[PDB]
Motif scaffolding. Structure first.
Motif, mmCIF file in Angstrom:
data_model
loop_
_atom_site.group_PDB
_atom_site.id
_atom_site.type_symbol
_atom_site.label_atom_id
_atom_site.label_comp_id
_atom_site.label_asym_id
_atom_site.label_seq_id
_atom_site.Cartn_x
_atom_site.Cartn_y
_atom_site.Cartn_z
ATOM 1 N N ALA A 1 31.518 52.588 -2.513
ATOM 2 C CA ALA A 1 32.372 51.398 -2.750
ATOM 3 C C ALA A 1 32.570 50.961 -4.209
ATOM 4 C CB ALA A 1 31.869 50.224 -1.897
ATOM 5 N N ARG A 2 31.921 51.657 -5.149
ATOM 6 C CA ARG A 2 32.068 51.398 -6.583
ATOM 7 C C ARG A 2 33.104 52.358 -7.173
ATOM 8 N NH1 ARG A 2 28.211 53.293 -9.343
ATOM 9 N NH2 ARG A 2 28.497 51.897 -11.142
ATOM 10 N N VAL A 3 34.192 51.795 -7.709
ATOM 11 C CA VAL A 3 35.386 52.577 -8.007
ATOM 12 C C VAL A 3 35.743 52.528 -9.484
ATOM 13 C CG1 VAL A 3 37.782 53.040 -7.376
ATOM 14 C CG2 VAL A 3 36.223 51.945 -5.737
ATOM 15 N N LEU A 4 35.983 53.693 -10.075
ATOM 16 C CA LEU A 4 36.540 53.778 -11.406
ATOM 17 C C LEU A 4 38.072 53.952 -11.313
ATOM 18 C CD1 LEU A 4 36.697 54.203 -14.434
ATOM 19 C CD2 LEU A 4 35.957 56.582 -14.102
ATOM 20 N N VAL A 5 38.828 52.980 -11.805
ATOM 21 C CA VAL A 5 40.287 53.012 -11.746
ATOM 22 C C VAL A 5 40.888 53.546 -13.058
ATOM 23 C CG1 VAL A 5 42.335 51.571 -11.540
ATOM 24 C CG2 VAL A 5 40.423 51.269 -9.974
ATOM 25 N N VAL A 6 41.647 54.637 -12.976
ATOM 26 C CA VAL A 6 42.207 55.284 -14.143
ATOM 27 C C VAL A 6 43.734 55.360 -14.019
ATOM 28 C CG1 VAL A 6 42.050 57.275 -15.694
ATOM 29 C CG2 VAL A 6 40.148 56.722 -14.125
ATOM 30 N N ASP A 7 44.437 54.902 -15.056
ATOM 31 C CA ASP A 7 45.891 54.776 -15.089
ATOM 32 C C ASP A 7 46.276 54.322 -16.499
ATOM 33 O OD1 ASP A 7 48.700 54.019 -14.378
ATOM 34 O OD2 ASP A 7 47.979 54.445 -12.347
ATOM 35 N N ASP A 8 47.341 54.873 -17.105
ATOM 36 C CA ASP A 8 47.666 54.467 -18.488
ATOM 37 C C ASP A 8 48.340 53.098 -18.584
ATOM 38 O OD1 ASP A 8 50.614 54.817 -18.532
ATOM 39 O OD2 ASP A 8 50.204 56.953 -18.650
ATOM 40 N N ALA A 9 48.832 52.598 -17.448
ATOM 41 C CA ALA A 9 49.535 51.333 -17.368
ATOM 42 C C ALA A 9 48.626 50.237 -16.844
ATOM 43 C CB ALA A 9 50.758 51.472 -16.479
ATOM 44 N N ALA A 10 48.398 49.243 -17.687
ATOM 45 C CA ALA A 10 47.492 48.138 -17.396
ATOM 46 C C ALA A 10 47.797 47.443 -16.075
ATOM 47 C CB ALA A 10 47.536 47.144 -18.552
#
Lengths: 117, 117
Positions: free
Chosen positions: A1-10
């Protein structure tokens, strides 16, 4: 349930963080690019990663080329460290006007900005 | 005297902004990567750009590979739009476990997070 969110757009990060948190998940970290995603994975050891398949993949040279394409009078100074000279060379070939070397001495940096102007 | 400062490291941007402003120059904008540098150049039409020759140049696929190299049990979901399917395919080949399609429906996103866990 611990998630690293990756995306270039804030805002995309935010939108996804909203949906995850609303489902009872904890966003323990975020990244705007590839390198940062990998570093943050080590430090955080998350259960899950969400990652945009498009990540910034434009180098300093091709960003010089794109800017010169837009405005052939663009004045660009490269920031470089020892060891990157082949790439700096090619940046200058592609229209960049100068460079400054890290670690900076403020005097040398402004000598170079002034020289370019 | 209007300068666009480009560097992937926030503190480097700051350090350079300090030195420039201290020399009577106006930092009219900032960028963390190539694409953003080019976009911001159009919008701001600055007199000068300072640009790190190293810019994030790691794609979603190779960031999957690096993460799998670190932890072969990593659970990664790709965020994709229509048209990027070849790259998503290869991400999944390289260890990614799933994907979700933009524009998101929150239900489908959590169906997919749950499926992966």
């Amino acid at each position: 349930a611990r998630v690293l969110v990756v995306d270039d757009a804030a805002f995309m990060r935010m939108l996804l963080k909203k949906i995850l948190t609303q489902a009872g998940h904890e966003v323990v970290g975020e990244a705007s690019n590839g390198k940062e995603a990998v570093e943050k994975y080590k430090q955080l050891k998350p259960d899950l990663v969400t990652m945009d398949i498009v990540m910034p993949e434009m180098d300093g040279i091709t960003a010089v080329k794109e800017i010169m394409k837009i405005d052939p009078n663009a004045k660009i100074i490269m920031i470089t460290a020892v060891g990157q000279e082949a790439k700096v060379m090619e940046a200058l070939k592609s229209g960049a006007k100068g460079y400054i070397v890290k670690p900076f001495q403020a005097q040398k940096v402004i000598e170079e900005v002034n020289r370019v102007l």
